[PDB]
């Protein structure tokens, strides 16, 4: 589709067999999900943003469906106040910016 | 222009009599720039992201140009490590996400 930006670009996703919404985020290199249960091995990492840093669990090879398109890749889980799909999955679903 | 997302979507902007590089950010409500001098007597403002909140300065009716598309709006300034163009300006230049 084509999504305008007068509102937050919040879309429906499926991950871990759960429906959620997430922000399609051109300014995020990575994908960061609100605190949840995911099965699998992970490893601690740390990410930085506006407020500073946070600890997150990194999981690789996680599948997510975003507005009907599938992507598989790394996902970080931690205390973000919003789920964020970053350029790592956005490129897989063919997403681009246009003006 | 069509921008893809293998790399950070950095473009060149003109603001405040200065040329700068910044990130087109669909997950930023507001535009936020690294410390510079701007025209006007600013109002304080709180913004949050990954890691909590920071206090920044808000300057309204600021002239900005992005890839030759002019826009006027609020621009915040404070301790971002990167310049960010938020949806407040992205909608003015007719920017959309597409897939
Ligand atoms: C991982 C990402 C989330 C991202 N950071 C990165 O990509 C970093 C630098 N990458 C990285 O990989 O480094 C860590 C690392 C190190 C070692 C190993 C592994 C990893 C990030 O924070 N990205 C931000 C840009 C940035 C980049 C570098 C440094 C600082 C900032 C925005 O693009 C990103 O789009 C976030 C998304 C977001 C939205 C909401 C909550 C949390 C995060 N938006 C924001 O941070 C913006 N906030 C907003 O848009 C908020 C929600 N609005 C707002 O606060 O308005 C007023 C308000 C007032 C009162 C209450 C509420 C709101 C902010 C820039 C304006």
Domain boundaries, chain B: 1-99
Q: What is the CATH number of domain A1-99?
A: 2.40.70.10
- CA distances in angstroms from B86 to A7, B4, B74, B76, listed in the order given: 11, 17, 10, 10
Determine the Cα–Cα distance for residues A31 and A40; give it in Å rounded to an integer. 17
- Compute the distance between CA of residue A9 and CA of residue B24 in angstroms, rounded to an integer: 14
Is B25 assigned a catalytic role? yes
- With a Cβ cut-off of 6 Å, ligand 1 is lined by A 25, 27-30, 32, 45-50, 80-82, 84; B 25, 27-30, 32, 46-50, 80-82, 84, 86
> In units of Å, what resolution does this entry have?
2.3
List of chain B residues whose C-beta atoms are within 8 Å of the C-beta of residue A52? 51-52
Residues whose CB is less than 8 angstroms from the CB of residue B79 and which lie 6 or more positions away in sequence, other chains included: B34, B35, B54, B56
Atom 39 (ligand 1): residue with closest C-alpha?
B49
Instruction: Give me the DSSP letters along A16-30.
Output: TTEEEEEEE-TT-SS
- CA B24/CA B95 separation, integer angstroms: 9
Name which of B93, B97, B98 to mutate to probe chain A: the one with the most chain A Cβ atoms within 10 A of its Cβ.
Answer: B97
CA dihedral A42, A15, B88, A52 (to 10 degrees): -20
**What is the experimental method?**
X-ray
């Amino acid at each position: 589709p084509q999504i305008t930006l007068a509102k937050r670009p919040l879309v429906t996703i499926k991950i871990g067999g759960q429906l959620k919404e997430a922000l399609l985020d051109t300014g995020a290199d990575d994908t960061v999900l609100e605190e949840m249960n995911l099965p699998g091995r992970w490893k601690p990492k740390m990410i930085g943003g506006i407020g500073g840093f946070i600890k997150v669990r990194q999981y690789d090879q996680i599948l997510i469906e975003i507005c009907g398109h599938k992507a598989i890749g790394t996902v970080l889980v931690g205390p973000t106040p919003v789920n964020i799909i970053g350029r790592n999955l956005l490129t897989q679903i063919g997403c681009t910016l246009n003006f």
